[PDB]
Design an enzyme around this catalytic site. Structure first.
Site, short mmCIF file in Angstrom:
data_model
loop_
_atom_site.label_atom_id
_atom_site.label_comp_id
_atom_site.label_asym_id
_atom_site.label_seq_id
_atom_site.Cartn_x
_atom_site.Cartn_y
_atom_site.Cartn_z
N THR A 4 2.58 -14.68 6.97
CA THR A 4 3.26 -13.98 5.85
C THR A 4 2.56 -12.64 5.65
O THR A 4 1.31 -12.63 5.66
CB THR A 4 3.26 -14.86 4.59
OG1 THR A 4 1.91 -15.22 4.31
CG2 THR A 4 4.10 -16.09 4.81
N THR A 64 -0.29 -4.84 11.78
CA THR A 64 -0.30 -3.38 11.85
C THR A 64 -0.98 -2.86 13.13
O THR A 64 -0.64 -1.75 13.53
CB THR A 64 -0.91 -2.80 10.57
OG1 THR A 64 -2.24 -3.27 10.50
CG2 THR A 64 -0.11 -3.17 9.36
N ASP A 65 -1.98 -3.55 13.68
CA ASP A 65 -2.82 -3.00 14.77
C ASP A 65 -1.97 -2.50 15.93
O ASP A 65 -2.34 -1.47 16.50
CB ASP A 65 -3.82 -4.03 15.26
CG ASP A 65 -4.91 -4.34 14.26
OD1 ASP A 65 -4.89 -3.76 13.15
OD2 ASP A 65 -5.72 -5.21 14.58
#
Lengths: 321, 318, 317, 319
Positions: free
Chosen positions: D12, D82-83
């Site tokens: 999540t 995000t990476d």
């Protein structure tokens, strides 16, 4: 070879110490001879001022003349040499009054041509390469500075002195020009040039629009003086997301009730001055200027006021352009 | 635990101590109770767009009282973001202490999805109690960043990352409470400031004018008629005025109203010895500030001089 | 008039007894009014050809020059590509508070609107300014004064390519007028523990570029080549791909120092995020970038290979 | 209401404490999204984005293509770490054969955090996904109230909620409490206009990335060749410049039929043709206005149909 007219609004932006049709453009070509190989250049001296002395009368003369030149089958593009201080206002004005898809490029220099490491020669050379590039068609009016192509809607001078002073803080440059190699990566999806509803062909004087600078412990007396001087519109450069000080808001409410258009912008530099935030625009009779800046909002409100002072119509204009 | 006072100037920026709005902050961010012994005071109850010199003077005098107390280690002030930069800059030159003064706010209301207030406030407490925050001057803590009051500005209308130091950068970071400084201002602040607002009830009036093509004289004239003691001109590019406006500013300056040149552009210095003959026209160049902070420094300057040379030295010092 | 030495590491960035410096003075004669200029040629290479041998020759020569009472400052003309690494190395190996200014040009001297002349003229003004003392090694480019710790080249071609993405410039220099607004609070120069005076070769430190579906074979090849340190330019906040992590854990167990940085461009590669540095035996590089973290790890390895001592070095400088 | 599928690639991104449990938990945490769209959910992968692989990219691209080919499906939203979001978004930008919106969204703070960014990012992402102006904008990343074109997007900071940037352009639009505005659009071809088709591909070509520095080496080029690299991205010094020893190994790589594409370590700008490296003589490609990790994705796609220097230069000068 493409035929391009350079309109000078002031002095040389490139070279120092010295038949195209204007002595300033002759001096540019003598200082940057590489441009002769790119285009057949004609020149005109449209005005003879620093950009801090610009007026609506000069904007009207320039727009009309750019429209006349680009209506000529022989003319491929116009380049305007311009002082950096108010280049963004002139470019925005032309972006909504030039009725052509042919390229219009504004260019200037943050350092005088006589300086060590003067930026004008490269900026002008790059400007010519952008003006003649096939991909520049229908991009709207652009500012070319520091190897970058900026959409007139989005461009601003964001620094007092830096060669990299031009920015598009809400987007970014639409393209690059590096030693004359032109590449576009984006285009504006906001209507410009042919898609603009504005027509200044019959206009001799633009409506008066003042700009006020908001701060703590603000005043009513500058709103009052704008009204007394016959302002048709006022841009309020508000605190944060276009917020006024209460004394000022009360005066703006009075201005709007008298039929003067009050358009909220921001002093902050970037972002949208949004609708349905802290200010009750519909109750007070104000417009929110959204994703512009005070000086470009002023140009759009001047143009709006040539045909309407109706709040809802002017909000639609700010929400469209 | 260190003793810190939170001074509120508006409502809650997130979501016993001596102020119901500070009690609500502690309910909203209970982890702060393990970091510090918090007292609360309500200095004003306004949005920051309603700020006045009266509230600035009340806040500065109260910060000076609190920091003179041996038990009080730091002050945090919760503040609306719109004018936080002006209040912080004012405190930076009027607070006579090396103890930390941290201003904090929230770009999103406490009731919002993804409200920034809880983390900002938690980070601000960590900065206030950090040993390295001593003698850094007044700071704004927002979005995990520590900004020198001299340098800080709100540069965006809505973004949680709206604060910036366009001419420098953040002097440090605070990430889940971990505080690190990388730089410090070398401009004098706090204890090293010449200004003393301890007995001042009202600050000098200073207007700000927004320059543009086809500019006017009527706003200079209205500022003079209203008793302006100073005018900041937010000029085109490197502080340039339109001719009609310049002539009105020259009149203003001959009358003994201080005219200080700033810029509308957003960053950079409004420099001396550029296109405006400041010495001939009787103006001051505000150098590396912005119009709204230049107004604060001119208001303070006018508490002790209206001399052009003396005020140019103030702008070239602070 | 102050005496300054210009050390050239390549050709002329614009246009004593070094012909390259004589050409600079011919190209920017206004500098001769500011200072008595001496010139030396330390190397004659593009900055993409830089090596530890040239860094050590330059640092020892800067140290000799600044120890002279007559020498007020050194300016080094340098290629832009790796100026940030040389500057950072000098920032921790120059044992002096006297100004050390690195300067270059994003456009060749022969270009329209060449940036070298103004950059060099500004660099001399910074070098002789009273306020430049004890600021550490600085990069002077595009009217900006950048702390060596913080400076990086962030763009391929722009004249404004230099930035300090975690701070900002510490000062400005506009047509020679020098103003500082901040200074570094991280120890540098005279305060650095490092001493390269008798060092002939720096420890080998490789840099690895992380991405999805990453590999162990580049870790393995660094180890086989005698790497003493590896900088891992990780994804986001210094995160490795699993296969790569396992190879780095092996490298650390073998006594090769693994220091986590990031490919992203700005921010700190932090301790106490998703990588258990203490369990895996890694160092977090915090607020640097992979190329500067490599310099600090090379210098660290001159005195220790201890994970705790190296973490303290990264958490200090 | 518009039907949108959320594909979860991990846990999540919003909340703490239908068709997939992670999407059920997102809807419980951000119930305002149910007012906007009929949401379906699928768990496509179960990883942090640092563990992403080409196998997962192929699975994801094929499933997005199937869902957008459904008349009733308006858009796909992909929750992602995000990476490596920028790599997945760039891959989808050249492999999704539809003009319907594809939105990638994540969170720089965990959902359990103080001031978690996930809830507003996801809410904004759903508003972007159902906006009619989002059609044919290409794959977008929605983060921090901003809409970034997949071609131009990168994670430029390790920790900031504002870590996403488009350093060569800028965001193409804004989304502020769900209000969606576009100001620009990419003029580089994407999605339905892309030549690439991964429908038949089970494995992408190996492409290594090398990090350039002073006193560089040949041994990492050599190890990439030994491991069967089909392509190498060189993250060069400044405008894509190699150290000489490394250049010699790259020239050997190129001669052996491994495609060498020059990018830059610096972060922004074009790695240009006709600069200091003689690309035509050494047999290299210049990646121009990308970054190493997105250059890797385009080279991997290029290698599915060609290893010809000229053809691959045309790809980098096109997309």
């Amino acid at each position: 070879k493409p035929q391009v007219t350079i309109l000078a609004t002031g002095g040389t932006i490139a070279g120092s110490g010295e038949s195209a049709g204007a002595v300033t453009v002759d001096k540019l070509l003598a200082a940057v001879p590489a441009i002769n190989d790119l285009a057949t250049i004609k020149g005109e001296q449209i005005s003879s001022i620093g950009s801090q002395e610009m007026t609506g009368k000069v904007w009207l003369k320039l727009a009309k003349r750019v429209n006349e030149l680009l209506a000529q089958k022989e003319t491929e593009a116009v380049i305007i040499t311009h002082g950096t201080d108010t280049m963004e206002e002139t470019a925005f004005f032309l972006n909504l009054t030039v009725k052509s898809q042919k390229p219009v490029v504004l260019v200037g220099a943050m350092r005088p041509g006589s300086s060590m490491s003067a930026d004008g020669p490269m900026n002008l050379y790059n400007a010519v390469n952008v003006a003649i590039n096939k991909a520049s068609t229908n991009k709207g009016v652009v500012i070319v500075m520091n190897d970058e192509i900026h959409a007139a809607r989005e461009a601003t001078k964001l620094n007092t002195t830096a060669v990299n002073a031009f920015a598009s803080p809400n987007t970014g440059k639409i393209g690059t020009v590096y030693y004359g190699k032109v590449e576009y990566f984006t285009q504006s999806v906001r209507p410009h040039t042919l898609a603009s509803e504005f027509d200044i062909s019959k206009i001799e004087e633009l409506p008066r629009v003042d700009i006020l600078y908001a701060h703590p412990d603000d005043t009513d007396v500058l709103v009052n003086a704008a009204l007394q001087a016959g302002a048709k519109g006022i841009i309020h450069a508000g605190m944060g997301n276009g917020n006024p000080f209460p004394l000022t808001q009360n005066a703006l409410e009075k201005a709007a009730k008298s039929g003067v258009v009050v358009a909220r912008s921001s002093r902050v530099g970037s972002g949208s001055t949004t609708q349905e935030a802290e200010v009750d625009d519909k109750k007070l009779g104000f417009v929110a200027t959204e994703s512009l800046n005070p000086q470009k909002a002023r140009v759009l409100l001047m143009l709006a006021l040539t045909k309407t002072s109706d709040r809802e119509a002017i909000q639609k204009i700010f929400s469209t352009y």
